Amino acid sequence: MGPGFDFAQAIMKKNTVIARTEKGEFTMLGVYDRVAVIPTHASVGEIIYINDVETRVLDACALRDLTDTNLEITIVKLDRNQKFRDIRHFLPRCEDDYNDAVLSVHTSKFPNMYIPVGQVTNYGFLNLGGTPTHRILMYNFPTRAGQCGGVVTTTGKVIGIHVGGNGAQGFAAMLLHSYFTD
Numbered sequence: 001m002g003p004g005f006d007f008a009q010a011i012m013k014k015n016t017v018i019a020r021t022e023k024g025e026f027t028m029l030g031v032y033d034r035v036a037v038i039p040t041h042a043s044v045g046e047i048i049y050i051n052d053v054e055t056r057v058l059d060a061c062a063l064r065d066l067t068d069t070n071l072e073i074t075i076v077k078l079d080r081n082q083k084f085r086d087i088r089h090f091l092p093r094c095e096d097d098y099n100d101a102v103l104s105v106h107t108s109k110f111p112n113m114y115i116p117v118g119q120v121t122n123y124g125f126l127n128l129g130g131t132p133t134h135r136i137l138m139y140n141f142p143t144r145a146g147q148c149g150g151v152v153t154t155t156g157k158v159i160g161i162h163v164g165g166n167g168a169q170g171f172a173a174m175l176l177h178s179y180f181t182d
Contacts, residue, residue: 003155004153005102005116007154007155008104008114008151008153009104011029011087011090011104011153011158012112012151015030015031015084015087015151016028016029016030016104016151017036017051018050018107019036019042019049019149020048020049020052021038021042021043021044021045021048022043023041023043024148025108026038026042026107026148026149027105027107027147027161028050028076028149029151029158029161030084031084031086031087031088031091031180032083032086032182033077033083033084033086034058034077034078034079034080035077035078035180036075036078036084037074037075037076037175038076038161039072039074039148039161039162039173040062040063040070040071041148042074042148042149044060044076048076050078055079056079057076057077057078058077058078058079059076059077060074060075061074061075062074065135069133069134070134071133071134071135071173071174072128072133072173073161073173075180088177090157091157091176091177091179091180092157092159092174092176092177093176093177093178095176096122096159097119097120097121098119098154099118099119099154100118100119100154100155101116101118101119101120101139101152101154101159102114102115102116102117102152102153102154103115103117103139103150103152105147105149107146113150115141115147115150117139117140117152117170118141119140120137120138120139120152120159120160121137121138123137124136126138128163128171135173135174135176136171136173136174137152137159137172137173137174138170139169139172140168141169141170142167142168142169142170143162143165143170144165147170148162148164150162152172159174159175160173160174161173161175
């Protein structure tokens with residue numbers, strides 16, 4: 001409807017796939033080459049389904065900060081025959097707060113879904129399903145089961161992936177440029 005949704009749509013149409021693990025279907029953001037991200041609670045194994053195609057996982061790393069605290073991001077390298085458009089220049093370099101964000105989801109359950117979530121707070125620490133977690137972004141939207149892996153954007157920036165909620169608020173793990181240096 002406006003330039004927020006325009007940037008979100010541009011990322012969804014070229015840089016997302018549907019990932020299926022034994023723990024469900026997730027929006028999965030492709031970042032560059034055959035490298036993508038997914039919430040760590042998806043429990044990626046040796047094989048994953050990508051748009052319903054059986055795909056070998058070449059590498060998977062659950063990220064933690066230098067306090068050895070969970071970040072809830074898993075970086076996955078996929079044995080896929082095609083590269084993603086490189087979107088690393090849209091990733092923030094530092095932790096920050098944001099205005100006027102969009103959460104975008106694409107699964108079998110929620111195709112072509114875009115949610116204007118509004119102001120995003122650098123929340124920091126969250127006990128997420130019992131697991132101490134750092135670098136959490138918070139927005140005041142009642143997000144639901146099925147939105148995990150959803151991409152959080154502002155105009156010009158890809159800032160996080162949705163990892164949970166409490167029924168009133170939603171929470172995303174930060175994406176930082178430093179996670180994807182090669």
